[PDB]
Amino acid sequence: FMKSTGIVRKVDELGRVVIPIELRRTLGIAEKDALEIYVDDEKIILKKYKPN
């Protein structure tokens, strides 16, 4: 099976979610960087964005 952090956050007015700082560092993501958003099985997959 796959292990997940299992951490939940409250949805703000715009419907946005925050990545834990531990994942900000491990994912190599910083302010002004670009994120790409995926949709599968009613779940959202977010990953670093590679320009095309």
Q: Which residues bind its own copies (CB under 8 A)?
A: 2-21, 23-24, 26-27, 29-47, 49, 51
Name the token pair of 37. Answer: 């958003």
Element at 24 (helix H, strand E): helix 21-26
Q: How far is the CB of 4 from its own copies (least distance, A)?
A: 3
Nearest to 24 by CA among 46, 52, 50: 46
State the nearest-atom distance from the C-beta of 34 to its own copies, in Å: 5
Distance of closest approach, residue 18 Cβ to its own copies, in angstroms: 4
